[PDB]
Write an enzyme that holds these catalytic residues in place. Sequence first.
Site, PDB file in Angstrom:
ATOM      1  N   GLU A  11       0.761  -1.238   0.000  1.00 48.05           N
ATOM      2  CA  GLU A  11       0.000   0.000   0.000  1.00 48.05           C
ATOM      3  C   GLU A  11       0.790   1.284   0.000  1.00 48.05           C
ATOM      4  O   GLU A  11       0.430   2.258  -0.642  1.00 48.05           O
ATOM      5  CB  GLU A  11      -1.174  -0.003   0.954  1.00 48.05           C
ATOM      6  CG  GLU A  11      -2.219  -1.032   0.478  1.00 48.05           C
ATOM      7  CD  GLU A  11      -3.077  -0.502  -0.637  1.00 48.05           C
ATOM      8  OE1 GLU A  11      -2.790   0.557  -1.232  1.00 48.05           O
ATOM      9  OE2 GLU A  11      -4.165  -1.264  -0.844  1.00 48.05           O
ATOM     10  N   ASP A  20      -6.242   7.397  -5.319  1.00 55.44           N
ATOM     11  CA  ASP A  20      -5.598   6.178  -5.712  1.00 55.44           C
ATOM     12  C   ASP A  20      -5.829   6.021  -7.195  1.00 55.44           C
ATOM     13  O   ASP A  20      -6.522   6.818  -7.827  1.00 55.44           O
ATOM     14  CB  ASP A  20      -6.146   4.927  -5.021  1.00 55.44           C
ATOM     15  CG  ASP A  20      -7.620   4.811  -5.179  1.00 55.44           C
ATOM     16  OD1 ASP A  20      -8.206   5.049  -6.220  1.00 55.44           O
ATOM     17  OD2 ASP A  20      -8.205   4.530  -4.044  1.00 55.44           O
ATOM     18  N   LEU A  32      -9.098   3.946   2.497  1.00 53.59           N
ATOM     19  CA  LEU A  32      -9.979   4.508   1.551  1.00 53.59           C
ATOM     20  C   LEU A  32     -10.845   5.507   2.226  1.00 53.59           C
ATOM     21  O   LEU A  32     -11.688   5.131   3.023  1.00 53.59           O
ATOM     22  CB  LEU A  32     -10.945   3.500   0.970  1.00 53.59           C
ATOM     23  CG  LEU A  32     -12.036   4.326   0.286  1.00 53.59           C
ATOM     24  CD1 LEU A  32     -11.741   4.604  -1.201  1.00 53.59           C
ATOM     25  CD2 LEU A  32     -13.429   3.752   0.521  1.00 53.59           C
ATOM     26  N   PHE A 107      -8.525  -6.625   1.043  1.00 52.53           N
ATOM     27  CA  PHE A 107      -8.360  -5.342   1.689  1.00 52.53           C
ATOM     28  C   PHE A 107      -8.138  -4.323   0.609  1.00 52.53           C
ATOM     29  O   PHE A 107      -7.245  -4.492  -0.222  1.00 52.53           O
ATOM     30  CB  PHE A 107      -7.079  -5.371   2.561  1.00 52.53           C
ATOM     31  CG  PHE A 107      -6.530  -4.035   3.076  1.00 52.53           C
ATOM     32  CD1 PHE A 107      -5.954  -3.091   2.225  1.00 52.53           C
ATOM     33  CD2 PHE A 107      -6.542  -3.757   4.449  1.00 52.53           C
ATOM     34  CE1 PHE A 107      -5.413  -1.908   2.733  1.00 52.53           C
ATOM     35  CE2 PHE A 107      -6.007  -2.582   4.981  1.00 52.53           C
ATOM     36  CZ  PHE A 107      -5.420  -1.666   4.108  1.00 52.53           C
ATOM     37  N   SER A 120     -19.137 -14.912  -7.449  1.00 48.52           N
ATOM     38  CA  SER A 120     -18.134 -15.519  -8.273  1.00 48.52           C
ATOM     39  C   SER A 120     -17.442 -16.627  -7.491  1.00 48.52           C
ATOM     40  O   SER A 120     -17.002 -17.636  -8.032  1.00 48.52           O
ATOM     41  CB  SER A 120     -17.168 -14.503  -8.868  1.00 48.52           C
ATOM     42  OG  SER A 120     -16.393 -13.911  -7.850  1.00 48.52           O
ATOM     43  N   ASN A 135      -8.289 -14.409  -9.771  1.00 41.90           N
ATOM     44  CA  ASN A 135      -9.072 -13.612 -10.680  1.00 41.90           C
ATOM     45  C   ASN A 135      -9.347 -12.197 -10.239  1.00 41.90           C
ATOM     46  O   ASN A 135      -9.279 -11.255 -11.016  1.00 41.90           O
ATOM     47  CB  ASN A 135     -10.384 -14.290 -10.982  1.00 41.90           C
ATOM     48  CG  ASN A 135     -10.475 -14.303 -12.461  1.00 41.90           C
ATOM     49  OD1 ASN A 135     -11.542 -14.055 -13.020  1.00 41.90           O
ATOM     50  ND2 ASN A 135      -9.293 -14.383 -13.076  1.00 41.90           N
TER      51      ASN A 135
END
Length: 165
Positions: A11, A20, A32, A107, A120, A135
């Site tokens: 990070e 970002d 965030l 994260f 998914s 993925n």
Amino acid sequence: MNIFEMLRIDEGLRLKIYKDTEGYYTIGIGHLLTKSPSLNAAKSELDKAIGRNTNGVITKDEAEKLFNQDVDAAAAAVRGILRNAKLKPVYDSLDAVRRAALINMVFQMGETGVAGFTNSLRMLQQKRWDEAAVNLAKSRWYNQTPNRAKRVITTFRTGTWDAYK
């Protein structure tokens, strides 16, 4: 080596509001703040977090404070994730490192991104389950920050820290 280290490695550490890759309002080692538009929004966000009128500035301590929470939380997500999507016993069968990457990968995913993965995931299978992982890291970090994306899957796919080493 470890998840902390690993995320600090991935990070980076910023003490002044920035955007970002995706152009969001973020801070510290991943924090965030907000997907909006107006900074203010993100600033204000920062403010309740910190509680002190940062005006887009924080401290190592401050940042380190946000971090830990962020981490404990990813760590928490992960479990719930495969909690649902069935495949809980997979969560259990895991080892340190795989599971660290898992925490990393997820994260600081946020409900919407979280949701999908789960889907998914289920729709995948107990043995397939793996690729959704690989993925998801791909895409999240591909195009833009491919070393990270590479660093992860590997670590995840190998159970070795050598990559970050």
